[PDB]
Amino acid sequence: KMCDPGMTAFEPEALGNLVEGLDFHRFYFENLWSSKPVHTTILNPHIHL
């Protein structure tokens, strides 16, 4: 819901390629994240309106 159907993506899992859509991240939602303790921390956020 929070992502556009034609979402553009640059990430190390794409190996320097540009990925379009949500099909690519689905593999990580299905396999890995479906789960040991994990803590995230956001540092120095900047927002441009």
Could you tell me what percentage of the chain is helix, strand and coil, using 3-state DSSP and rounding each to the nearest 5? 20, 10, 65
CB 15 within 8 A of CB 5: no
* Residue 24 in the binding site for its own copies (CB under 8 A): yes
Residue whose C-alpha is closest to residue 19's, from 27, 8, 28: 8
User: Count residues contacting its own copies (CB under 8 A)?
Assistant: 14
* Residue 46 in the binding site for its own copies (CB under 8 A): no
* Residue 29 in the binding site for its own copies (CB under 8 A): no
Q: Which residues bind its own copies (CB under 8 A)?
A: 17-19, 23-24, 26-27, 30-31, 37, 39, 41, 43-44
